[PDB]
Design a protein around this ligand. Structure first.
Ligand SMILES: Nc1nc(=O)c2ncn([C@@H]3O[C@@H]4COP(=O)(O)O[C@H]5[C@@H](O)[C@H](n6cnc7c(N)ncnc76)O[C@@H]5COP(=O)(O)O[C@@H]3[C@@H]4O)c2[nH]1
Lengths: 294, 294
């Protein structure tokens, strides 16, 4: 199997390194008269933060009813601990205000790549987590409990392997015809369908397929579909989206899906996530996962 | 029809208000000796930004190969115009460094609601835009060109109305049985299906339905499905997601879908977005949209 390097979540040791550098710099400040001097700089920052809120009253007043329907807007305007800044302003000029305005005009407070990356993958509001929730709720929550009955119905036409391997290709190749993927992968038949009236559509139909892979074992197998969506979210270039970020979002999607099916409760063992990169081959990986459980 | 208040995109007039306040404050500074003093504050900011990059070398060194595979990491570490800060540091102490570290330790640089809102909806990497791209590529790109042929095939069993009204309920109510939605909405039949081998599944089936609404007109009609996903992304509470943000994300989804089908090229006039809030009724709105085109 190929080496799976998916990124871990952020541990948050940067604050620890900042604290250590703070303590070391205080020790070198060792080897009372200057503490007031600290305040002469400190509220100098906390003015400008307030200034940012003042400018954020600018556009938000054009969004009163359409986004916020007064006190809600000013509640949303500045960071929530606003009284510390005024508390520090009271404990004491135009140069500071003009410097903060000269910063805020030219826009030199642009965050870097790693900061927006941690802000993206920290919140659960990016593309990959929402799309993984869509794939979990819309498909996997519904089909997977009805898998064993259709398997038994085809059985009247190996109980360890009655699962649903989801191929998750961390990359670009997504194929509709898996018989073009290898000469070893062969189509045999399909499962009995599933009929559900979902979201106004009456009798929506979910299907499957059964693939026999030999040298001599059957399995159910399909691709994780919405990666295909990402495959058109950068090729068509109508979304601001790059290939390196495409690989990043695919790894994030596999990580989020692994997390969701980790704490899943209905999906007992019926799923089996197979993920890979491009280093024939795919049948060899399928056979390795298939023999691994036995 | 109900009043549709969807939020406009950010115009960006806050920078203009900052510039005006800058010019006015410079005029009051009117009515050369102090400009060097500006630099004594100015690089005082640009040190600390560099300090943030120093702390962002901390956790990123635990993410060398798993996210970035040296120079790529330091390239991603600080904001890209790094030389202006060192240029300003050269033009001239421990108090400034300790103040910036004391800020970065306690974490008082937390962005407000409106800043993270503009950062979210500014980039095309939130939940609603990616999910709208999924609904456009997976379903609307495929089905809609094959609509007229199925309509003509049922016609051999009103050409102005041969469309697909997508009900987009900006809210919480999403129903599977539209006959429970009103006594006026009646199910009649379904369109001939669509069979496509998509993403490894052989013979995936797309269906539709035809609803006759009288007092005396037929139409095709369905719900925008993945809003249902959002309806379970906060009720089950396994995602950090609120109801006010649910209404916000639904409005954002309708806006993004309106934008995508605005610049669409295959979907000629075959879609017709109907969106509403909860103020019987739904049939009255459907009849108003249906009579509006004629
Ligand atoms: N009304 C309606 N009838 C349909 O047959 C249908 N099929 C798809 N869709 C909607 O279009 C989009 C395309 O599916 P996508 O591939 O991007 O992810 C889909 C897809 O990965 C998976 N899935 C759903 N139905 C099938 C299916 N029959 N076969 C394989 N996978 C499916 O579940 C994901 C989410 O489905 P929904 O989020 O409930 O609505 C889908 C989706 O929004 C349909 N909408």
């Amino acid at each position: 199997p190929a080496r799976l390097l998916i990124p871990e979540p952020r541990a948050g040791r940067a604050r620890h390194a900042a604290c250590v550098l703070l303590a070391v710099c205080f020790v070198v400040l060792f080897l009372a008269p200057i503490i007031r001097s600290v305040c002469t700089q400190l509220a100098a920052l906390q003015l400008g933060v307030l200034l940012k809120g003042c400018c954020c009253l600018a556009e938000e007043i054009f969004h009163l009813h359409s986004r916020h329907h007064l006190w809600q807007v000013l509640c949303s305007c500045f960071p929530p601990r606003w009284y510390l800044a005024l508390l520090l302003v009271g404990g004491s000029l135009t140069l500071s205000c003009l410097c903060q305005l000269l910063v805020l005009a030219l826009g030199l407070q642009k965050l870097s790549a790693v900061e927006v990356s941690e802000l993206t993958e920290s919140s659960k509001k990016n593309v990959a987590h929402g799309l993984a929730w869509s794939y979990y709720i819309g498909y996997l929550k519904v089909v997977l409990p009805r898998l064993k009955e259709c398997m038994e119905e085809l059985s009247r036409t190996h109980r360890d392997t009655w699962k649903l391997h989801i191929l998750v290709p961390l990359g670009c190749d997504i194929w509709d015809d898996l018989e073009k993927a290898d000469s070893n992968i062969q189509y045999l038949a399909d499962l009995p369908e599933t009929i559900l009236t979902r979201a106004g559509i009456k009798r929506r139909v979910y299907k499957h397929s059964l693939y026999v892979i030999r040298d001599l074992r059957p399995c159910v197998l399909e691709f994780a579909s919405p990666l295909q969506t990402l495959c058109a979210m950068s090729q068509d270039d109508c979304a601001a989206f790059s290939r390196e970020q495409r690989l990043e979002q695919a790894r994030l999607f596999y990580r989020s899906l692994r997390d969701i099916l980790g704490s899943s409760k209905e999906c007992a063992g019926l799923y089996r996530l197979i993920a890979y990169e491009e280093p024939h081959f795919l049948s060899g990986l399928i056979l390795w996962h298939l023999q691994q459980q036995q």
